[PDB]
Design an enzyme around this catalytic site. Structure first.
Site, PDB file in Angstrom:
ATOM      1  N   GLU B 166       0.954  -1.260   0.218  1.00  0.00           N
ATOM      2  CA  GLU B 166      -0.169   0.057   0.103  1.00  0.00           C
ATOM      3  C   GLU B 166       0.776   1.221   0.109  1.00  0.00           C
ATOM      4  OE1 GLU B 166      -2.346  -0.586   3.589  1.00  0.00           O
ATOM      5  OE2 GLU B 166      -4.071  -1.489   2.333  1.00  0.00           O
ATOM      6  N   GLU B 374      -5.089  -8.449   1.480  1.00  0.00           N
ATOM      7  CA  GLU B 374      -5.601  -8.127   2.722  1.00  0.00           C
ATOM      8  C   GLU B 374      -7.192  -8.042   2.243  1.00  0.00           C
ATOM      9  OE1 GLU B 374      -2.349  -5.129   4.630  1.00  0.00           O
ATOM     10  OE2 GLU B 374      -4.431  -4.659   4.686  1.00  0.00           O
TER      11      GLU B 374
HETATM   12  O1  BG6 Z   1      -9.197  -0.080  10.239  1.00  0.00           O
HETATM   13  P1  BG6 Z   1      -7.807   0.398  10.598  1.00  0.00           P
HETATM   14  O2  BG6 Z   1      -7.595   0.064  12.077  1.00  0.00           O
HETATM   15  O3  BG6 Z   1      -7.276   1.819  10.393  1.00  0.00           O
HETATM   16  O4  BG6 Z   1      -6.678  -0.593   9.666  1.00  0.00           O
HETATM   17  C1  BG6 Z   1      -6.765  -0.779   8.361  1.00  0.00           C
HETATM   18  C2  BG6 Z   1      -5.851  -1.834   8.015  1.00  0.00           C
HETATM   19  O5  BG6 Z   1      -6.021  -2.228   6.489  1.00  0.00           O
HETATM   20  C3  BG6 Z   1      -4.747  -1.427   5.617  1.00  0.00           C
HETATM   21  O6  BG6 Z   1      -5.038  -0.019   5.517  1.00  0.00           O
HETATM   22  C4  BG6 Z   1      -3.470  -1.676   6.482  1.00  0.00           C
HETATM   23  O7  BG6 Z   1      -2.716  -2.474   5.493  1.00  0.00           O
HETATM   24  C5  BG6 Z   1      -3.599  -2.475   7.648  1.00  0.00           C
HETATM   25  O8  BG6 Z   1      -2.126  -2.338   8.049  1.00  0.00           O
HETATM   26  C6  BG6 Z   1      -4.323  -1.831   8.571  1.00  0.00           C
HETATM   27  O9  BG6 Z   1      -4.260  -2.595   9.684  1.00  0.00           O
END
Ligand code: BG6
Ligand code: BG6
Lengths: 474, 474
Positions: B166, B374
């Protein structure tokens, strides 16, 4: 703050041979599939056909003089294959070539750039008789021979060339909807002929590199950019399917030499995908064009279409605004009226921003220069006393589209030129004469042929002023 | 009739080193930019940081045993650059490499495929100190030395590699929004650092082809597919702007080595386009990845935004729904709530069909295989007596997204695998601990580490069954 139109922007206007020439059997011209098809009863509005059309074959000198009066930078026309090879693949007809020579010389003697379209839907009936025309791989080498004949004869005078004009239209109308020759309703045959036309396009671009090395060439696509109805995910997905199935299906082949994978898989699951031979992909991928030709009139809004749902809809033949119905592919998408634009009385969307969108989409996806080969408004024109045709409606449509082009150029799209449709009134393939597109009114209707005299419309002088001020005054 | 998930489909789960590991100053590890940033007052919720996180550094054997119980096919993790090079580019810390070796050996001994992420936002502070980290071309060769160190040590045992995780997030949060290190709010610097990271990415993909000739490598893009609000032409145009500026700006470079023209020209018109050196385009175009990695959580809907309109919006870091406000770029687009989907308490849209749309767009535009690196749902969980966690909300979200993945595979998209975010609960960069993503609950909150004990949630057993049936039972 807008950029100006580049100094050598091709301010153009366009026609199509069958739609304008007439002389359908003079000086040795052979029969085209449209000569035959249009005389079948019930095919065309009130039996109108191209026997005479607006008789541009005999009146081209008057026509080119009006172009020079207007100050056209460019004029796009199509060469009638059946004037040049009456048999399609037999001996050359010198008289056929001689007419296009006389026309080109006339254009140049007035400083007008010719843009030669190779194919605008008039394959010689003999090739349809001999082997089914676009359904046989034989048409690839016959079309090449025809194209090379024109390249050798006019390449030294013609920089800009268009290969197939609106391949998606004459394939679709001719083999899925049955509205064009050969009048077929068979999607399996549709995609076979479409694939053969793709190879034909690629073969002649390859030839063009050999015979006209300093020229520029490209196909011209009838582009209706798709919109989703709303941000409902199912409607956005329907838009993904629609843009890929209606548009990428053709433009990816032209630009990249390959069909999009999802549409291919859907066709394969139906047994509709075309037959592929060794060497097809290499040929298709080895024929990069210098530009994408774009015929644009309107955008299309789509929504989710269940497996049960819409197929072929009702096209608007009459002019009674509202008579169209949704067309679709079950499971993928169906059209729906866009509530945020106006339409003509033929239910064609008036969406000049849609042209900027489509120009941005082509640049963003392919990074190709774009030649706008067709854009215009068809409407009834009244001839008023004093040789006055006040087509303010036409001016209003053209102005807004030209304005959005300028915005596209300012965004970074490379637009080579713009060809309004059309220069004179002409014969509509199916709808006759009363839906006029011309800057120049032609004195005839569906009943009476009259004298076919040319009369400058208000839009003629509007566009004269556009070219004079290189687009600064619209 | 859906295609099955392919037989070697990587059913995975994922984490990131800063969020999970702890041991922030053990065994020779140096400081990263996040060690420093999170201890500055006001940067993170209740002052939470990764000093301990959920202590996966000491507890990795227990965590891997839980992955094996679940039957995980793959585990994606990131390597902490500051464990390997404590000062970023000097001498290697062998104890640091030895941890990841023990981790990979533990995975392989349980038949789990490791997927190594080179960079998940934690560049060593010493490189930020020496030359400003991603803002200097010095990082290209430093990142390469580090990548090659990993390739040589683990390439025999790791087939799948991700380069930058990302980039669009850590670059824009770091240099445009000031919410990540180095806390800069400067669009010019943002695009310069972004360009340097593109070069670093391409450089290590080049090295990988030499050192790991049989492996597969790609970057991972935080992909929010854009939707227009409706069929209004100005809103479709904002969609074209949004998808090009937010998405093609990164993925076109990754796939084609080229920035999109319209976005470039808009940046150039503002003095914001990056400095390009000789050989940059050559490097960027010659580093094709094997797959596009995709982090997907939500789609974004956009409407027209006037030149005086919306810029930065209010982000939701509390968990009270309805707090978010529109963000945009004046004159191009602004976001708007999609009325046709639900949102989480943090205002993230729940749009599983959007995942199919995004996968279709990537295959349609780049024809690349996709590894979903992810996807997950962040929500408060309740630990009920008897160590029970019923997270049906998480099952429901993962199930519908995995369902839409199968529809995309059936459409023809080549999806290599699916890594749920996350395996265990972990530290959110800004949001602390209570917004949980794990299959495995970790007993701690923002105020106490408690005993950090691991507790399988209901979604653990749901995913276990998904993997056992290769996704036939969702
Ligand atoms: O919903 P949050 O707590 O802001 O996290 C978003 C997650 O999704 C992504 O943005 C990141 O790759 C992750 O590292 C992160 O944990
Ligand atoms: O049916 P109408 O309104 O006359 O439109 C026909 C025009 O539509 C275009 O598709 C064709 O390229 C032109 O050849 C033709 O003139």
């Amino acid at each position: 703050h807008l950029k100006p139109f580049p100094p050598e922007f091709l301010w153009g206007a366009a026609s199509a041979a069958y739609q304008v020439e007439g002389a359908w059997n003079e000086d040795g011209k052979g029969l085209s599939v449209w000569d035959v098809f249009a005389k079948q009863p019930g095919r065309t509005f009130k039996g109108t056909n191209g026997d005479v059309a607006v008789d541009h074959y005999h009146r081209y000198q008057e026509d080119v003089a009006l172009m020079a009066e207007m100050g056209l930078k460019a004029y796009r026309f199509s060469v009638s294959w059946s004037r040049v090879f009456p048999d399609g693949n037999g001996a050359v007809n010198e008289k056929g070539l001689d007419f296009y020579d006389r026309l080109i010389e006339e254009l140049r003697n007035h400083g007008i750039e010719p843009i030669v379209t190779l194919y605008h839907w008039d394959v010689p009936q003999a090739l349809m008789d001999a082997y089914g025309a676009w359904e046989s791989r034989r048409i690839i080498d016959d079309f090449d021979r025809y194209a090379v004949t024109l390249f050798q004869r006019f390449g030294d005078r013609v920089k800009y060339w268009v290969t197939l004009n609106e391949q998606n239209i004459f394939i679709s109308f001719g083999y899925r909807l049955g509205l064009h020759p050969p009048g077929v309703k068979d999607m399996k045959r549709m995609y076979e002929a479409n694939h053969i036309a793709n190879l034909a396009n690629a073969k002649v671009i390859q030839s063009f590199r050999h015979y006209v090395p300093d020229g520029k060439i490209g196909p011209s696509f009838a582009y209706s950019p798709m919109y989703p109805y709303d941000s409902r995910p199912e409607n956005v997905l329907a838009f993904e399917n629609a843009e890929e199935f209606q548009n990428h299906w053709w433009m990816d082949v032209y630009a990249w030499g390959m069909y999009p994978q999802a549409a291919w898989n859907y066709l394969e699951s139906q047994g509709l995908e075309p037959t592929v031979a060794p060497g097809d992909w290499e040929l298709l991928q080895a024929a990069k064009p210098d530009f994408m030709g774009v015929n644009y009139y309107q955008t299309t809004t789509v929504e989710h279409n269940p497996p049960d749902g819409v197929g072929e809809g009702v096209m608007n033949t009459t002019g009674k605004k509202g008579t169209s119905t949704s067309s679709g592919i079950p499971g993928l998408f169906k059209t729906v009226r866009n509530p945020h634009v106006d339409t003509t009385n033929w239910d064609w969307a008036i969406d000049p921003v849609g042209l900027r969108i489509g120009l941005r989409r082509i640049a963003n996806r392919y990074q190709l220069p774009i030649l706008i080969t067709e854009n215009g408004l068809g409407e009834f024109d009244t001839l008023e006393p004093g040789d006055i045709v006040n087509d303010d409606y036409r001016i209003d449509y053209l102005r807004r589209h030209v304005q959005e082009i300028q915005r596209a150029i300012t965004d970074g799209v490379d637009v080579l030129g713009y060809c309004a449709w059309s220069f004179t009134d002409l014969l509509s393939w199916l709808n006759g004469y009363q839906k006029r597109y011309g800057f120049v009114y032609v004195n005839r209707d569906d009943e009476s042929e009259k004298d076919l005299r040319r009369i400058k419309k208000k839009s003629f002088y509007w566009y004269q002023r556009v070219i004079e001020t290189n687009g600064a005054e619209l």
